[PDB]
Design a protein around this nucleic acid. Structure first.
Lengths: 194, 223
DNA sequence: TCGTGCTGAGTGATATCTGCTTTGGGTGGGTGGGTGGGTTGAGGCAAT
DNA sequence: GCAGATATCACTCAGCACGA
């Protein structure tokens, strides 16, 4: 039902692995094939997945590695294009500012009505095409990512997709060095640069 | 799709006893209702969301005997650690035998069984219908906050966050302060303001509410 | 130059007649009623 | 007793040839 949209999942950890196996094909082939009780057909599921998970313990412990704190099979975490890590550290200033921000309810932002039109126009008309400068340094970036060691071809494809997506934002038909630099910058700083 | 107990309490207070006996499905799906007032199901044929704006009151007891304060709270009941965190107020009620306490308890239940009213005459119990009218009138009102009380709330939240920096050693400290605690303090303060029928929340309401969040963990975590 | 009585033809209204059930199935019901009848088996999916 | 499909009989009209 989310063909062309963005699927949303709240509690990914609290899900039996039997159901999670379905998502293996969605994120890889963008299609689902069913063959049972005389029905043999494939339904397109060209949708984006946005899932969230919570740590095994009451909080996240920095000491242990990522594969232990969040659950989920290690291989599954590699499929996701970006895997963020947001933690609620305790500080005398961050907490103060957050409290002042969540209590005012009782730096301009574009109206949502115009933003939806913006994204729709960008998604329909623009179609970026990679350039030679992009490839010359994308090979470098991927090989460097693999050298420091989890890092597989899926990461390079994610870099390609992110570089293409960022160019879409600025309404350009060519992906420049800056956009791919931003993509790689985002990827390293998501898991977090210890 | 047939809704369960939670949906029948929409726009009301659901009433749950034996909270321990929930199965896995409810153990996991009660988080949705507690966080976001809606139940979402995407099973075989139904991909809709049930609207359930119901507050939850729950209770549980040891299966066999009495509580053991020395042992962790999770060591006597099956509820997971995550579930107990979401509750705004958590109360641990204890029954410690004692001659003096039981004497008065028996005398009070006894006076009730004799005349169907309170023994003490210091106060007259409020009539039921009048109390319901007052509750409705209070729920009609909608108060608001201000910067002056906001400063007090934020300072109190800062103190609460700092305090938990040392209490994290105990493994049963699921009541560790989080922004949810700040929002709960705000909610309780607004409740007290509603009872006063006023519109502007004052320092009194916030200080009283902070006492009910404190006396609910201190007396029920230290004992 | 023409007027009218006789005839075949065709509808209109009315006479008898058959029929008044009918039917498998739950968006036809059970105040329509069982002498009007309805007698599976594999495969998929939630609960666990 | 009631509606519908069907066939029966009786009555009246336009043409025709002759006589006025």
């Amino acid at each position: 039902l989310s063909d062309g949209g963005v699927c949303c999942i709240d509690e990914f950890d609290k899900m039996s692995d039997s159901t999670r196996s379905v998502l293996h094909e969605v994120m890889e082939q963008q299609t689902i094939s069913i063959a049972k009780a005389g029905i043999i057909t494939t339904l397109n599921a060209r949708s984006s997945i946005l899932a969230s998970a919570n740590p095994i313990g009451s909080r996240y412990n920095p000491n242990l590695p990522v594969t232990e704190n969040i659950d989920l099979p290690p291989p599954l975490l590699s499929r996701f294009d970006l895997v963020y890590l947001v933690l609620d550290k305790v500080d005398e200033k961050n907490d103060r500012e957050l409290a002042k921000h969540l209590t005012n309810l009782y730096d301009d932002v574009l109206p949502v009505e115009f933003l939806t039109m913006y994204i729709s126009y960008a998604k329909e008309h623009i179609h970026p095409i990679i350039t030679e400068a992009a490839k010359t340094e994308l090979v470098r970036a991927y090989v460097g990512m693999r050298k420091m060691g989890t890092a597989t071809t899926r990461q390079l494809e994610s870099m390609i997709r992110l570089a293409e997506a960022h160019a879409k934002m600025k309404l350009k038909n060519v992906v420049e060095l800056e956009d791919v630099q931003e993509a790689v910058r985002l990827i390293r700083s998501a898991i977090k640069d210890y | 799709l047939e809704g369960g107990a939670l949906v029948l309490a929409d726009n009301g207070i659901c009433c749950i006893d034996e909270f321990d006996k929930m199965d896995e499905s409810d153990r996991t799906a009660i988080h949705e209702v507690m966080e976001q007032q809606t139940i979402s199901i995407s099973k075989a044929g139904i991909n809709t969301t049930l609207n359930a704006r119901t507050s939850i009151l729950a209770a549980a007891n040891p299966l066999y005997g009495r509580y053991n304060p020395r042992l962790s709270p999770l060591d006597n009941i099956n509820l997971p650690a995550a579930l107990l965190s979401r509750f705004d107020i958590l109360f641990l009620m204890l029954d410690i035998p004692s001659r003096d306490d039981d004497e008065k308890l028996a005398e009070h239940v006894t006076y009730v069984h004799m005349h169907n009213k309170q023994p003490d005459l210091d106060f007259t119990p409020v009539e039921p219908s009048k109390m319901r009218e007052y509750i409705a009138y209070a729920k009609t009102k909608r108060p608001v906050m201000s910067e002056a009380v906001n400063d007090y709330v934020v300072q109190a939240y800062i103190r609460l966050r700092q305090d938990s920096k040392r209490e994290m050693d105990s493994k049963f400290s699921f009541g560790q302060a989080t922004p949810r605690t700040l929002l709960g303090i705000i909610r309780l303060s607004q409740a007290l303001a509603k009872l006063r029928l006023a519109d502007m929340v004052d320092i009194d309401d916030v200080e009283e509410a902070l006492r009910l969040v404190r006396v609910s963990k201190e007396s029920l975590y230290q004992e």
